């Protein structure tokens with residue numbers, strides 16, 4: 225099945241809680257500003273040397289699924305980390321946990337990683353749905369990837 | 381309309397063999413799926429087994445003096461009581477046309 | 487000529503057969519006269535395998551998504567015993583076909599332009615001014631995955647990726663050349 229990326233991203237803040245991106249910057253998050261019928265305009269934020277960097281991006285909705293009835297991905301042009309595509313492949317029952325395939329290409333190297341993203345400020349003593357985190361842990365074990373959390377409670 | 385009923389069909393260059401005779405309906409002839417029939421005394425023999433495409437013929441020679449030419453090849457829907465691939469009726473041919481060069485194409 | 491003797495019992499138990507009668511000189515012409523006999527009973531018809539058809543999607547039990555990753559899943563395809571009738575034989579062999587796969591289904595990849603394919607067939611055959619085509623295709627850079635064994639078993643790439651290459655002559659996926667087929671013979675039906 226295919227969960228709608230246009231529904232998941234129509235929320236105020238989406239935080240990256242866990243990722244296999246090599247050496248990710250701290251406090252990676254997306255803040256929706258205005259979604260259209262075929263694309264969403266949003267602000268991608270992250271911390272570098274204590275400085276908040278903001279990219280104003282447009283993600284054009286597309287389909288990675290076979291039925292081509294529910295949007296589940298976005299193409300992004302000019303993202304500063306080279307991310308050109310994102311594919312939403314799982315959303316939790318409480319709709320607070322989402323699993324992403326991220327495709328990036330920067331100077332003749334195209335790479336892939338995965339994210340766990342939360343549709344709101346994560347909580348301290350409330351873990352995400354066990355199926356959501358378990359599929360990601362199984363991916364990490366099956367690929368011999370190193371996982372890191374970009375999120376901290378001090379993120380603005 | 382009575383047909384000619386044969387006991388054998390020859391999978392290669394499809395031809396009827398082992399004539400029983402000529403006063404029978406197709407239904408009775410093809411009660412035995414190993415059998416084959418003919419419309420009238422010397423035309424196309426259709427086997428009674430379910431329709432399926434025949435093997436492509438060998439490539440016919442290609443019309444050239446010395447240059448590049450072209451050549452044809454064919455196959456036929458052969459059988460009875462049904463249809464071959466692509467909702468096609470028994471007897472219908474399919475053709476393929478290939479470019480050809482006999483010599484160095486002088 | 488004596489009288490025609492009786493017709494022998496039909497020698498087949500289904501479909502048509504040939505029964506003869508004989509005569510004795512008690513004489514020019516036929517001592518024997520054959521006839522077709524109808525049993526009116528249909529013979530058995532053995533079933534025959536259909537074609538395999540398309541592969542099911544590449545999936546791993548208890549993994550929602552494998553695409554674009556070096557994670558074997560597995561796939562199956564089926565075929566149906568068709569036409570078995572009036573007590574004919576059932577089909578022999580495996581009904582289901584199974585294999586291990588890597589999913590590159592809908593994975594956007596960097597591409598490079600392939601070399602030219604060979605010229606296709608002349609289309610339409612027998613039609614007016616038949617022309618043939620060849621194409622240059624945007625091929626994604628295929629990953630170097632190991633064909634090892636998840637037991638020693640094969641793992642096949644499966645799925646249609648979305649390759650990204652620089653545009654060549656105004657096209658992003660397929661560049662096509664046509665060329666007439668020349669000196670076309672005519673399709674004389676052999677009957």
Ligand SMILES: *[C@@H]1O[C@@H](C)[C@@H](O)[C@@H](O[C@@H]2O[C@H](CO)[C@@H](O)[C@H](O)[C@H]2O)[C@@H]1O
Nearest residue numbers: 412413414498499500501527528529530
């Ligand atoms: C007599 O009873 C019939 C029901 C059939 O089972 C006969 O066998 C059939 O004999 C013909 C040969 O004329 C074959 O074409 C069939 O394949 C075979 O099943 C049986 O002799």
Ligand SMILES: *[C@H]1O[C@H](CO)[C@@H](O)[C@H](O)[C@@H]1O
Nearest residue numbers: 433434435436437454455
């Ligand atoms: C024609 O095409 C190929 C041989 O060229 C085979 O699959 C088969 O002979 C078919 O009838």
Ligand SMILES: *[C@H]1O[C@H](CO)[C@@H](O)[C@H](O)[C@@H]1O
Nearest residue numbers: 436437438439440453478
């Ligand atoms: C036609 O094409 C070639 C002959 O050059 C062979 O593969 C075969 O004879 C086919 O029928």
Ligand SMILES: *[C@H]1O[C@H](CO)[C@@H](O)[C@H](O)[C@@H]1O
Nearest residue numbers: 487488489490491509519
């Ligand atoms: C055979 O043909 C008929 C019987 O059907 C008769 O004219 C005669 O018995 C002949 O021998």
Ligand SMILES: *[C@H]1O[C@H](CO)[C@@H](O)[C@H](O)[C@@H]1O
Nearest residue numbers: 487488509513514515516
């Ligand atoms: C036998 O066949 C017929 C008789 O019915 C005649 O042509 C002739 O008597 C021959 O001996």
Ligand SMILES: *[C@H]1O[C@H](CO)[C@@H](O)[C@H](O)[C@@H]1O
Nearest residue numbers: 535536537538539565583
């Ligand atoms: C199934 O297996 C292959 C197709 O991949 C062929 O030999 C044939 O189509 C068969 O039905």
Ligand SMILES: *[C@H]1O[C@H](CO)[C@@H](O)[C@H](O)[C@@H]1O
Nearest residue numbers: 539540541563643644645
């Ligand atoms: C599935 O596997 C490949 C496609 O990747 C083909 O051999 C065929 O389509 C089969 O059904």
Ligand SMILES: *[C@H]1O[C@H](CO)[C@@H](O)[C@H](O)[C@@H]1O
Nearest residue numbers: 597598599651652653654
């Ligand atoms: C397209 O494919 C590659 C670039 O992706 C190059 O070989 C060349 O630019 C070609 O036109």
Ligand SMILES: *[C@H]1O[C@H](CO)[C@@H](O)[C@H](O)[C@@H]1O
Nearest residue numbers: 600601602603620621622
């Ligand atoms: C196709 O055309 C010619 C050779 O046929 C070359 O320029 C090159 O191989 C291209 O792929």
Ligand SMILES: *[C@H]1O[C@H](CO)[C@@H](O)[C@H](O)[C@@H]1O
Nearest residue numbers: 479480481603604605620
């Ligand atoms: C197209 O033209 C020649 C002659 O037919 C072929 O041999 C070759 O495959 C090329 O692609």
